[PDB]
Amino acid sequence: AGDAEAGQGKVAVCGACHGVDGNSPAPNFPKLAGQGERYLLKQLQDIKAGSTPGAPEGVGRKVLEMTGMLDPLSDQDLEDIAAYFSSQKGSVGYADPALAKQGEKLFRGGKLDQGMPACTGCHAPNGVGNDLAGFPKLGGQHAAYTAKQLTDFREGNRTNDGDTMIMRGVAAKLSNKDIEALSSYIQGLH
Ligand code: HEC
Ligand code: HEC
C-alpha cells in the first residue's frame, strides 16, 4: 500500500492530462480519481514496462502518450501515486439514453447467445469494481476511453490482462455498436 500524501507530490507531470485530482474532462484520458489502488498500481507497473523506450514488444501496456514517463519512478513511488489517485473523489458523466438503454442491457445481461458474460459480476451493478480482486472501477469513466479499451482488448492491442485472460475473451464478442452502447451507459453509472 502507498502513502497518498507522498503520491500527491509525485504527479506534477500527470496533471495537464489527468487533472490534478485525477478528474480531467479530456475524453480520451482516463479519470484516475477514486480508482482502486491495486488496479492503479498494476497499470502503472504495466505501463512503465511497456512504454519505456526500447521496451520488448508485447510486454506490459504500451501507452504512447506516456512514453518514458514512469521510468524515473520506483516501485514505492508508483504505490504512492496509486494511493493518491485512489483517495480522490470520482465523478459521473452523461449517459445518452439513445445509447445507454442498450448499453445497460449488455452490461447487466451479457450476450449469452455468444457465451459472453454480463459485466456486473466483476465490475459491480453500479460499476464500482472490486479492488481487492483488482477489477477496476468503470462507473463514470469517459466513454471514449472505455470504448478504446474494449476495442483494444478485442483487437489484441491491450494484452496486460494475461494474469487472468478475462477481458480479451469478453471483448472478443463485442461489436462496435455494443462498445459504443456500453461505454455510454458506463459514463453515467454509479
Ligand atoms: C497526457 C499526455 C498524459 C500524461 C501527462 C499522463 N498520462 Fe496517463 N494516460 C494517458 C492516456 C492517453 C492514457 C490512456 C491510454 C489508452 O489506453 O487509451 C493514460 C492511461 C493512464 C493510466 C491507466 C488508467 C486505467 O484506467 O487503466 C494510468 C494509471 C495513468 N495514465 C497514470 C498516469 C500518471 C501517474 C501520470 C503522471 C506520472 C500520467 N498518467 C501522465 C495520458 C497521459
Ligand atoms: C470478470 C470475469 C470480468 C468480467 C465478466 C468483465 N470484466 Fe472487465 N475487467 C476485468 C479485469 C480483471 C480487468 C482488468 C485487466 C487489467 O488490465 O488488469 C478488467 C478491465 C476492464 C476495463 C479496463 C478499465 C480501465 O480503466 O482501463 C474495461 C473498460 C472493462 N473491463 C469493461 C468490461 C465490460 C464492459 C464488461 C462486460 C461486457 C466486462 N469488462 C466484463 C474483469 C471482468
Swiss-Prot record:
Could you say which residues bind heme c 2 here? 119, 122-123, 167
Among InterPro entries, the record links this protein to: Cyt_c-like_dom, Cyt_c-like_dom_sf, Cytochrome_c4-like, Cytochrome_c_Oxidase_Subunit
Listed as disulfide-bonded, the cysteine pairs are none
Q: How is it modified after translation?
A: Binds 2 heme c groups covalently per subunit.
* A Gene Ontology term for the protein's cellular component: periplasmic space
Major subcellular location class: periplasm
Q: Which residues bind heme c 1?
A: 14, 17-18, 66
Checking Pfam families in the record gives:
Cytochrom_C
Q: Name one GO molecular function term.
A: heme binding
The subcellular location is: Periplasm
Key words of the record: Electron transport, Heme, Iron, Metal-binding, Periplasm, Signal, Transport
Q: Give the matching PANTHER family.
A: CBB3-TYPE CYTOCHROME C OXIDASE SUBUNIT FIXP, CYTOCHROME C4
Any idea what job this protein has?
Diheme, high potential cytochrome c believed to be an intermediate electron donor to terminal oxidation systems.
- Name-wise, this protein is Cytochrome c4
Origin species: Stutzerimonas stutzeri
The top of its lineage is: Bacteria, Pseudomonadati, Pseudomonadota, Gammaproteobacteria, Pseudomonadales
